[PDB]
Design a protein around this ligand. Structure first.
Ligand SMILES: *[C@@H]1O[C@H](CO)[C@@H](O[C@@H]2O[C@H](CO)[C@@H](O)[C@H](O)[C@H]2NC(C)=O)[C@H](O)[C@H]1NC(C)=O
Lengths: 109, 495, 72, 127, 49
């Protein structure tokens, strides 16, 4: 019962690509709880987006996202070289639990 | 120009006050706006799309019962206890059989029995619901001065294709050659969702009332209930046959589909398959025409010798259409279209495609106009090549005033209080009429709803008969607004 | 069952036609009058019972129509 | 100024019980929950954690509710995992995770932000 | 027509959203936010009241 974000995604520097993830009506379909976690490999994961489209202090305004029912997205406008880390989605069910997506490692070249 | 041939027309005229006009437009109605300048446009709502619905309750239609079993127990020593009474899949029913020595118990009395069978499912329906945001209305704005073969078609683009949301804005439509029309549409008060459930059976779909949809006896399931085993009111699709006072048994009640197409006599059918499209309802508009050009100044007047390639055809209440085709030089030009009486002294009847021009000489132009009652002489060109065509609009009278009255009361029958649009804020008459119509509307509705085609006529004859017998001049109190109005509404419902 | 309460007096109606109008608009009068011509004795019974109670001359017709209309 | 340090276990053979610790520093420990996630090298994040408070309640995962248990002590301001019955596929990095409980002490709904501040990550292996 | 509740809502640190709250009247009202270009006008309808 995990979310369904794809394997990987690629982007040239300067592009504006998107990362999608689907789910069910208890994961994403009703609730405004969806978060994203950038995780460099020798590093603890750092959160990039709050509830649907909000954003932590220190995180640049390059990161954004939206929700379209069961499907949540993440659009990185202006890819730089330091976006070379996988992005794990997150959600909170109606049941009370927490799920994370599969992970999309993003290369920059 | 997409508006000719549609039997619901609703010519609206007057940009008075500021530079705006109120219009309200349906799906099966294309509205034409006229003005002293500001060329005539055509507005038709083509579709309504609700984007992301979430189902709330899943009824089921046809089921089957397996693993059927029963269990009985001796008289006066308690109810039976079956092992799979613990699941809420199995539908249960306790009743009393007759037991004795032949059954192998003793005491010769009425025992107890229980019966269970697992309730699976075969055919569901989904009741999907939307909130009045995240849904758009597609509306098409086709200007006049028709080019070759564009009269009433929908195939192929001839006008702008603006989408309007409740999230939207001024919504500038930038018509090519013409100006820029802006529409302050209000989609939230249009069709009143949150009381609408987008019901969806096997390959069809409807638009049903919410409280009607929740009060519907079939075994249901919540819309978020994955692994749909726990059907809730399963006793409306099973029955328990205890004919004599002996062995009882379960039989499924059958597919409720044909009794569901009879449940929906009044649900306007929609399309929920590759998109949750609707083709019913309406929205009112605020139509601002502050920036519109006529496209025809700095085009010199023509030099005659036109030629007609499609004759005068009165399409539906005196709005004749001619397709002339121009022969001559100076091909960007206005045309000399006038409608006279017999001797060319007075101009009678307006032109509707105001300022018709010719572009690309070997391509005809459609000309729509409105003749008066009687003889009229349609005139194109100048004197060396004059076309003086005859037309007799079939001479009515104030009969078009009585059918404009019947059209107006019809539009007050479909549209409740939004029908006080098509008017550019008369103020002391339009707003007070809309306000008292909302007061008398909410005392009509929720005190006369639930009854149908026949009962409205019956109660209307009862109120009319009571009014024709009372005293203290309450006769005209109980006829002119509650009697005859409920007979007229009694015959115009079930549209 | 669900063939009852047929979603009629709801409001919600527009100029496009419903699911089955022009068929389910004259079903109930046809149904109750084939019921009358195939069960006439209850209509005679409602004529005597309706004529007995209800003094004034309009109450006979109203009580008679309602008594022959409730029984399907 | 908020730091959450951990402690690492070296090598645990299958069958032995293993426990990890996180030292939550920089905030009031009794008014913030404590979640636990895990990550095998090259795989997902699945959610192991429970819902601490000043109360000390739990909400385990559906996958291994009958596997993990808790203890904690606010006098030491540390929350303790307890993973018994270690298995062969259980080589993963165990991250620490916090979020804030309600002002009424209980943890009924989470905050909109979940894991703003994190831990280190504790690696276990098998042999 | 319509009372604002979050009084003088300000923008600080532009790349961070601001949430505003007001009371519309009993009919339909309109929510003007911008000024001359992109005047972010919205519709809202309120029942009864
Ligand atoms: C409605 O408009 C379409 C679009 O122009 C018309 O279709 C054209 O018909 C002519 C006939 O000579 C063809 O040469 C074009 O190729 C068609 N254009 C298309 C298909 O895009 C259509 O005839 C119009 N309908 C009516 C009733 O006039």
């Amino acid at each position: 019962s995990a979310l369904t974000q794809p394997a990987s995604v690629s982007g040239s520097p300067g592009q504006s690509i998107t990362i999608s993830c689907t789910g069910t009506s208890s994961d994403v379909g009703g609730f405004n709880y969806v978060s994203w976690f950038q995780q460099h490999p020798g590093k603890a994961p750092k959160l990039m987006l709050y509830d649907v489209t909000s954003r932590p202090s220190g995180v640049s305004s390059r990161f954004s996202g939206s929700k379209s029912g069961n499907t949540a997205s993440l659009t990185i406008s202006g890819l730089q070289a330091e976006d070379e880390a996988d992005y794990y989605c997150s959600s909170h069910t109606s049941r009370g639990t927490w799920v994370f997506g599969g992970g999309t490692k993003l290369t920059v070249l | 120009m997409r508006c000719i041939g549609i039997s619901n027309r609703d010519f609206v005229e007057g940009v008075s006050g500021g530079s705006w006009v109120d219009i309200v437009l349906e799906h099966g109605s294309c509205v034409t706006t006229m003005a002293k300048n500001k060329p005539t446009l055509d507005f038709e709502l083509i579709e309504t799309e609700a984007k992301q619905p979430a189902t709330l309750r899943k009824y089921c239609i046809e089921a089957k019962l397996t693993n059927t079993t029963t269990d009985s127990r001796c008289p006066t020593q308690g109810e039976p206890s079956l092992n799979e009474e613990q699941d809420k899949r199995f539908v249960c029913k306790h009743s009393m059989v007759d037991r004795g020595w032949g059954n192998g118990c003793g005491l010769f009395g009425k025992g107890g029995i229980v019966t269970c069978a697992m309730f699976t499912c075969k055919k569901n329906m989904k009741g999907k619901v939307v909130q009045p945001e995240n849904l758009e209305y597609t509306i098409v704005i086709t200007p006049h001065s028709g080019e070759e073969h564009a009269v009433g078609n929908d195939t192929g683009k001839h006008g702008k294709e603006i989408k309007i949301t409740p999230q939207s804005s001024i919504t500038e439509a930038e018509l090519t050659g013409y100006g820029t029309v802006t529409m302050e549409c209000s989609p939230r008060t249009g069709l009143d969702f949150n009381e609408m459930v987008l019901l969806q059976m096997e390959n069809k779909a409807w638009l049903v009332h919410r409280q009607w949809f929740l009060d519907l006896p079939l075994p249901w399931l919540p819309g978020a209930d994955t692994q749909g085993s726990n059907w809730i009111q399963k006793e409306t699709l099973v029955t328990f046959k205890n004919p004599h006072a002996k062995k009882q048994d379960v039989v499924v009640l059958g597919s409720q589909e044909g009794a569901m197409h009879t449940a929906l006599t009044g649900a306007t059918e929609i399309q929920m398959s590759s998109g949750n499209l609707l083709f019913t309802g309406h929205l009112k508009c605020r139509l601002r025409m502050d920036k519109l050009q006529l496209k025809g100044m700095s085009y010199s007047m023509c030099t005659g010798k036109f030629k007609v390639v499609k004759e005068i055809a009165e399409t539906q209440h005196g709005t004749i259409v001619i397709r002339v085709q121009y022969e001559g030089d100076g091909s960007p030009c206005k045309i000399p279209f006038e409608i006279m009486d017999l001797e060319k002294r007075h101009v009678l009847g307006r032109l509707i495609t105001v300022n018709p021009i010719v572009t690309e000489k070997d391509s005809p132009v459609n000309i729509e106009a409105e003749p008066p009652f009687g003889d009229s002489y349609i005139i194109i060109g100048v004197e060396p090549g004059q076309l003086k065509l005859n037309w007799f609009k079939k001479g009515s009278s104030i009969g078009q005033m009585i059918e404009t009255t019947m059209r107006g009361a019809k539009r007050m029958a479909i549209l409740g209080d939004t029908a006080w649009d098509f008017g550019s804020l008369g103020g002391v008459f339009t707003s007070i009429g809309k306000a008292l119509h909302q007061v008398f509307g909410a005392i009509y509705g929720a005190a006369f709803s639930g009854v149908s085609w026949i009962m409205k006529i019956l109660i209307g004859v009862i109120i009319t008969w009571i009014g024709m017998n009372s005293r203290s001049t309450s006769l005209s109190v109980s006829l002119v607004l509650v009697g005859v109005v409920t007979l007229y509404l009694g015959v115009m419902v079930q549209a | 069952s669900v063939a009852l309460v047929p979603h009629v007096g709801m409001g919600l109606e527009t100029r496009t036609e419903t699911w089955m109008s022009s068929e389910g608009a004259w079903k109930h009068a046809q149904r109750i009058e084939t019921w009358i011509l195939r069960h006439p004795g209850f209509t005679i019974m409602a004529a005597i019972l309706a004529y007995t109670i209800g003094t004034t001359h309009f109450q006979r017709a109203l009580i008679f129509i309602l008594l022959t209309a409730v029984a399907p | 100024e908020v730091q959450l340090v951990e402690s690492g276990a070296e090598v645990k053979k299958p069958g032995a019980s293993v426990k990890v610790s996180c030292k939550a520093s920089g905030y009031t420990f009794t008014s913030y929950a404590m979640h636990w996630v895990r990550q095998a090298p090259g795989q997902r994040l699945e959610w192991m954690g429970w819902i601490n408070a000043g109360n000390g309640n739990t909400k385990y995962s559906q996958k291994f509710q009958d596997r993990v248990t808790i203890t904690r002590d606010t006098s030491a301001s540390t929350a303790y995992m307890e993973l018994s019955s270690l298995r062969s596929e259980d080589t993963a990095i165990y991250y620490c995770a916090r979020d804030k409980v309600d002002d009424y002490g209980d943890y009924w709904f989470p905050t909109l932000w979940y894991f703003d501040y994190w831990g280190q990550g504790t690696l276990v292996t098998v042999s």
